[PDB]
Design an enzyme around this catalytic site. Structure first.
Site, mmCIF file in Angstrom:
data_model
loop_
_atom_site.group_PDB
_atom_site.id
_atom_site.type_symbol
_atom_site.label_atom_id
_atom_site.label_comp_id
_atom_site.label_asym_id
_atom_site.label_seq_id
_atom_site.Cartn_x
_atom_site.Cartn_y
_atom_site.Cartn_z
ATOM 1 N N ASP A 1 -1.959 -0.793 5.585
ATOM 2 C CA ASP A 1 -0.744 -0.027 5.824
ATOM 3 C C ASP A 1 0.513 -0.873 5.673
ATOM 4 O O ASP A 1 1.549 -0.574 6.269
ATOM 5 C CB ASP A 1 -0.795 0.642 7.196
ATOM 6 C CG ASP A 1 -1.834 1.733 7.258
ATOM 7 O OD1 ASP A 1 -2.105 2.345 6.209
ATOM 8 O OD2 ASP A 1 -2.406 1.960 8.344
ATOM 9 N N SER A 2 0.441 -1.925 4.866
ATOM 10 C CA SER A 2 1.646 -2.622 4.454
ATOM 11 C C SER A 2 2.340 -1.872 3.326
ATOM 12 O O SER A 2 1.859 -0.850 2.837
ATOM 13 C CB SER A 2 1.336 -4.036 3.999
ATOM 14 O OG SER A 2 2.426 -4.530 3.239
#
Ligand SMILES: [Zn+2]
Ligand SMILES: [Zn+2]
Ligand SMILES: [Zn+2]
Ligand SMILES: [Zn+2]
Lengths: 147, 279, 49, 56, 53, 53, 56, 44, 66, 49, 56
Positions: free
Chosen positions: A4-5
């Site tokens: 989830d970067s």
């Protein structure tokens, strides 16, 4: 991107995505501590205070305030205080001259830097010199923001 | 013992040394040589971020009562035991006077500064043979006016005796002796906005009244003996110079003031209506 | 070059939070002392630990 | 508990991470402001003398 | 400034206005230019005026 | 002053691009996703006509 | 244990005092030394003791 | 020019206690001195 | 607020057609799709910019400060 | 019939002021009839919020 | 911390663009996705300590 970067376009950031204002305020006011004479919002000279900071106090004016629109760094000073006691052997006792400061001038928070803007001054509930300032600072989005 | 620590660089010695403080690391360095002097500074702001002693004196005040993890059977014993040491100190009477001047100042809606200055005025003497009792209310009535005036706030004797009937002359002698006390231990322009506040007027009549009061103070015609009243008739002549019905009977009943003196001031400014208007 | 797979890709609505990085970056060495305990004081504001 | 078996410390850092596929396990990525802020003592030998002098 | 907008706001707004770009080879980069503070060889000057009429 | 596009998009002149090669998958560098048919689940290129099927 | 624990010591007669560091004055940043809880309570103790001794 | 206080575009030039409540206005908030001094910006 | 300059997606000059995009509504009673057609942004990358900008500067400026 | 009533006015106004400032929900009696979250600081980040 | 993990040592390659950086491998024993969690760092002072961190 993993876990989830995010990857982003710094060119889009350049074009002007997600730019943001940041207003911050300050509360400051004086007191009576006598022998009723109150504090003052003075511009410090060299021989003015007790235990002076390293604020490089040139950004203030004769009213002890800062004119809006100039830029400020983190450690810079914006307000000025002086101790009105009266009676405590006011400016010739246990100190140099450097008269009666015991100066509690409020510096800005030492990290953020920007442009001060639209300083207002108005008496408080009982009638004193009561001061609020506001500083404006752009924050371009960086690597470490929570989206 | 001389109770003294002086800080001096052991390698420059040019003066009481030109030194600086690095509060971000809490150390001190002689700016010339660049050597430390001492370390581990103690903060000077975090304690004010953490949490009336001069008026309560060296002995410290303590109110006691009840909590959650306690018993009513012994907190009532505590409520009847809280007065078992009020007679050891005169601070019970000091705080009774403090409470009563708090009653008075907040009854007249006076601010915190006025309250604390009256506290100061009582704490100043609080005991002389000149004080000598005098109903114990004359002293506080003098002290509240003293603190009010030294707060650069003016309040009338009529307000003071509307607060407490002090027969107006025990009050006066108390004022004289307290004046002598304060001078040993060592202004009516602001009456005008309160009068127009009770009368409900805009700014220009008030500014005109201030200007006319200044001019009449400068020239002549004391003429009223306590010129509070000639200030009042300066408002009267200003409002008659304008066209708002604030008639003399209404002014007299509003301000509790003599209408014959109003007509006397009206005549003496009817003579002197010339040089008192700027625009 | 050509890409093997294909991509679902298009317009979408996002928004911005408050916890920005400059209020959370914080480091310290040999700073202020608390007088009760002789330890480093609290608070990012007064340069804590 | 808050003073003996745990307490405040010195030489501390506190930020937020991002991944990377080019740094192996025994490394770590450290930002340069923090590198300026921290420190580490060394000693003076005949070995480290020139590099330490240059870095001074 | 007097508007209801911020000043660096107006700046970043300005920064995207393109200009005429024919003879751009003739002038020189300020980094390579021997002068300081924007000589006529290395830069141009802009003036803007508005009024609340 | 001068500036270039690579450090900031202020100096970019391009602000669009288009790019195509092998419109008809003849080099077969990549297949297409499909659920039942490769052909009908995709549209033709606009560049279709300049190379034969 | 006789050398360290004998029940007359277990009843309090003479009370030691704590030093200024344990009960430090916070110097409350405008005019106060900011006296704190422990010194406050000890002053209470001394007042009550002198009252009792005068009474008896 | 030191104070504005109000909707007036007036350079009131107040310094110390000359009827701080603005005369040709009706305010008591005393706006303060937008700066004559030249500023720097950085539009990168 | 202000319709911005130079689309994040494409990047051409945007906002020339802005008050034009206004006046293709009132005095033409013209549907927006064909309005954007005759407006002439054949991509969508810019079309979204004007499709979802919301004016705020009118509500801003209809104060009367100073 | 006048001197006490104005300090009564101070008491009523001061009591309501203290209550809606703190959120301790009761008179000056150190948290009796006590429950706290009644006087939250208003959330002022976003119109939706 | 829960178990013997969360306590790695590292070498350092110093990185600009201020934040941390680490390997995608060690993420699940650290028990932390990139949802904004923050890290804590310490630096030894003497050689015994540095050596024992290095070797263990
Ligand atoms: Zn020295
Ligand atoms: Zn040049
Ligand atoms: Zn005005
Ligand atoms: Zn576009």
């Amino acid at each position: 991107n993993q876990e989830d970067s995010m990857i982003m376009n710094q060119s889009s950031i350049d074009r002007g995505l997600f730019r943001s204002l940041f207003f911050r305020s300050y509360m400051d006011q004086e007191k009576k501590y006598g022998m009723s004479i109150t504090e003052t919002f003075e511009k410090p000279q060299r021989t003015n205070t007790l235990r002076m900071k390293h604020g490089t106090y040139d950004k203030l004016d004769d009213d002890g305030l800062i004119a809006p629109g100039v830029r400020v760094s983190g450690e810079d000073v914006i307000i000025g205080k002086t101790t009105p006691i009266s009676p405590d052997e006011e400016e010739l006792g246990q100190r140099t001259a450097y008269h009666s400061k015991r100066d509690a001038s409020t510096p800005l928070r030492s990290t953020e830097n920007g442009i001060v803007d639209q300083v207002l001054v108005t008496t408080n509930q009982d009638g004193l010199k009561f001061v609020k300032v506001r500083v404006r600072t752009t924050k371009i989005p960086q690597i470490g923001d929570k989206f | 013992p001389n109770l003294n620590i002086v800080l001096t660089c052991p390698e420059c010695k040019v003066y009481p040394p030109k030194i600086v403080e690095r509060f971000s690391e809490g150390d001190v360095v002689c700016a010339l040589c660049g050597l430390v002097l001492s370390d581990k500074l103690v903060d000077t702001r975090s304690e004010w971020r953490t949490f009336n002693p001069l008026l309560d004196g060296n002995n410290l005040s303590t109110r006691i009562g009840k909590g959650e993890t306690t018993d009513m059977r012994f907190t009532k014993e505590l409520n009847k035991a809280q007065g078992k040491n009020v007679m050891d100190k005169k601070d019970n009477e000091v705080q009774a006077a403090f409470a009563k001047i708090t009653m008075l100042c907040d009854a007249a809606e006076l601010p915190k500064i006025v309250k604390d200055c009256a506290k100061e005025a009582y704490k100043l003497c609080h005991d002389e043979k000149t004080l000598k009792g005098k109903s114990m209310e004359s002293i506080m009535a003098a002290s509240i006016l003293i603190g009010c005036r030294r707060a650069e706030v003016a309040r009338t004797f009529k307000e003071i005796q509307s607060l407490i009937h002090v027969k107006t002359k025990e009050f006066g002698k108390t004022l004289n002796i307290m004046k002598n006390i304060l001078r040993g231990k060592s202004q009516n322009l602001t009456y005008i906005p309160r009068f127009c506040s009770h009368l409900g007027l805009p700014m220009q009549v008030t500014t005109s009244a201030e200007y006319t009061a200044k001019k009449c103070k400068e020239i002549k015609e004391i003429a009223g003996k306590s010129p509070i009243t000639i200030a009042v008739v300066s408002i009267y002549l200003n409002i008659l110079l304008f066209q708002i019905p604030i008639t003399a009977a209404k002014v007299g009943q509003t301000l509790q003031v003599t209408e014959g003196t109003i007509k006397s001031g009206y005549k003496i400014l009817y003579e002197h209506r010339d040089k008192l208007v700027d625009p | 070059k050509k890409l093997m797979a294909q991509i679902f890709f298009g317009p979408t609505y996002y928004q911005r939070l408050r916890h920005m990085v400059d209020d959370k970056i914080h480091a310290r060495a040999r700073g202020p002392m608390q007088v009760l305990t002789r330890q480093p004081v609290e608070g990012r504001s007064r340069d804590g630990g | 508990r808050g003073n003996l078996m745990g307490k405040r410390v010195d030489f501390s850092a506190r930020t937020v991470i991002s991944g990377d596929p080019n740094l192996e396990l025994d490394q770590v990525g450290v930002p340069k402001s923090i590198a300026k802020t921290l420190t580490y003592p060394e000693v003076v030998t005949p070995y480290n003398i020139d590099r330490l002098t240059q870095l001074v | 400034n007097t508007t209801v907008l911020a000043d660096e706001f107006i700046a970043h707004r300005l920064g995207l206005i393109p200009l005429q770009s024919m003879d751009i080879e003739q002038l020189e980069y300020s980094r390579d230019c021997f002068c300081e503070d924007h000589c006529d060889k290395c830069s141009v000057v802009l003036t803007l005026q508005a009024f609340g009429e | 002053k001068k500036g270039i596009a690579k450090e900031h998009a202020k100096w970019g002149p391009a602000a669009a691009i288009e790019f195509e090669y092998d419109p008809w998958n003849k080099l077969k560098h990549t297949d297409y996703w499909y659920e039942q048919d490769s052909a009908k689940e995709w549209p033709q290129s606009k560049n279709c006509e300049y190379e034969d099927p | 244990n006789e050398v360290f624990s004998r029940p007359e010591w277990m009843i309090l007669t003479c009370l030691p005092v704590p030093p200024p560091p344990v009960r430090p004055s916070i110097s409350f940043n405008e005019s106060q030394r900011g006296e704190d809880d422990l010194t406050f309570k000890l002053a209470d103790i001394l007042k009550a003791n002198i009252s009792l001794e005068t009474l008896e | 020019l030191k104070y504005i206080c109000a909707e007036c575009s007036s350079k009131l030039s107040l310094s110390r206690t000359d009827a701080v409540r603005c005369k040709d206005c009706g305010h008591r908030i005393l706006l303060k001195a937008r700066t004559k001094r030249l500023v720097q910006f950085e539009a990168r | 607020m202000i319709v911005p300059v130079r689309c994040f997606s494409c990047g051409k000059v945007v906002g020339d057609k802005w008050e034009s995009y206004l006046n293709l509504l009132q005095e033409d009673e013209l549907d927006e799709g064909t309005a954007l057609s005759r407006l002439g942004l054949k991509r969508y990358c810019c079309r979204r910019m004007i499709l979802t900008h919301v004016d705020l500067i009118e509500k801003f400026l209809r104060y009367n400060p100073l | 019939f006048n001197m006490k009533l104005a300090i009564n006015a101070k008491t009523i106004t001061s009591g309501l002021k203290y209550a809606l400032a703190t959120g301790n929900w009761g008179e000056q009696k150190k948290a009796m009839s006590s429950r706290a979250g009644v006087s939250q600081v208003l959330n002022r980040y976003t119109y939706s919020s | 911390s829960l178990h013997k993990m969360s306590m790695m040592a590292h070498r350092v390659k110093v990185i600009p663009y201020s934040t941390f950086r680490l390997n995608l491998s060690v993420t699940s024993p650290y028990n932390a996705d990139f949802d904004g969690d923050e890290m804590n760092l310490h630096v030894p002072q003497s050689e015994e300590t540095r050596a024992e961190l290095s070797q263990l």
